[PDB]
Amino acid sequence: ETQYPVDRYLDWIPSLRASAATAATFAEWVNTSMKTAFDLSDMLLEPL
Amino acid sequence: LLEFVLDNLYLNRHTGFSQDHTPFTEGANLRSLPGPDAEKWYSIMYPT
Numbered sequence: 001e002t003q004y005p006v007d008r009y010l011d012w013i014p015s016l017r018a019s020a021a022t023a024a025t026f027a028e029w030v031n032t033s034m035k036t037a038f039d040l041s042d043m044l045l046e047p048l
Numbered sequence: 049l050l051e052f053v054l055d056n057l058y059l060n061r062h063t064g065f066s067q068d069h070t071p072f073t074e075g076a077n078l079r080s081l082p083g084p085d086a087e088k089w090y091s092i093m094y095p096t
Contacts, residue, residue, distance in 0.1 A: 016074075019075075019077065021067075
């Protein structure tokens with residue numbers, strides 16, 4: 001749930017309401033994936 | 049009666065909760081004790 005508008009047509013796809021911490025950890029995994037995807041040896045958005 | 053009062057003179061330190069990963073509850077944050085075998089406490093805390 002974020003104020004930024006984004007279209008969701010796959011809310012039918014199953015998902016629970018994660019705690020803010022849970023979302024952050026999932027986000028951290030996505031971020032590690034992005035760094036490896038661009039082969040980033042440096043920290044990305046760590047303050048974020 | 050006085051001793052029961054004497055035995056109860058404590059400060060309750062704010063505890064911690066964990067989002068439920070199972071469908072028994074709707075991903076609730078359960079007060080989580082340190083150490084294992086807390087599930088006996090979890091079942092007692094929420095007979096529901």
